Amino acid sequence: GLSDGEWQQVLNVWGKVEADIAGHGQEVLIRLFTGHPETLEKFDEFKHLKTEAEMKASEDLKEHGTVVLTALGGILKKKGHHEAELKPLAQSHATKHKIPIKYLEFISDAIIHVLHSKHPGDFGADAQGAMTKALELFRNDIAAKYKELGFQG
Numbered sequence: 001g002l003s004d005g006e007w008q009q010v011l012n013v014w015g016k017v018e019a020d021i022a023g024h025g026q027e028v029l030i031r032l033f034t035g036h037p038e039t040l041e042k043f044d045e046f047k048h049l050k051t052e053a054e055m056k057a058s059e060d061l062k063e064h065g066t067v068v069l070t071a072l073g074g075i076l077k078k079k080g081h082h083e084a085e086l087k088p089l090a091q092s093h094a095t096k097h098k099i100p101i102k103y104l105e106f107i108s109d110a111i112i113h114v115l116h117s118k119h120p121g122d123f124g125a126d127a128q129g130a131m132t133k134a135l136e137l138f139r140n141d142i143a144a145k146y147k148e149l150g151f152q153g
């Protein structure tokens, strides 16, 4: 867990994202897909967008980025009391999309990268500490449900 002070740093940084969720969303997906090409293959509707420039030219990709960060923001705002929002996501990523936990690790690092990239010098050490914790929490709770389901990957 996170202290209230850590949660207040998480939500304060999330406010920066909300200034433009789609722009942040697109950056996260691109970092993921260029950094770990294997992840693109799980998306049937984007697997043909193998380079950064192709990825940038798709509003469909950008609306998916929007969906991803609006879901995440909604989870962060629960401050760890997220059992109800997390179970459906774990189940669908495990059973429908077949997303190994490693990919969640990847997107987690991608978010940190993007925050530093879009707000250089504005994402403090303290802020980073708290955001990291928050994503680890998220990952760890998804991990528990994967285990329940035996999604070996």
Ligand code: HEM
Pocket (backbone or CB within 6 Å): 039, 040, 042, 043, 044, 045, 064, 067, 068, 069, 071, 072, 088, 089, 092, 093, 097, 099, 103, 104, 107
């Ligand atoms: C911050 C972590 C993530 C969040 C919040 C998230 C959220 C979502 C949401 C809300 C949906 C739509 C509803 C559903 O199908 O459950 C979805 C679908 C999907 N997710 Fe994720 N996701 C995350 C990570 C990932 C990663 C790392 C991958 C793959 C490398 C992935 C692959 C997919 C795919 C393939 C679908 C179906 C897509 C489509 O129909 O275009 N997700 N995700």
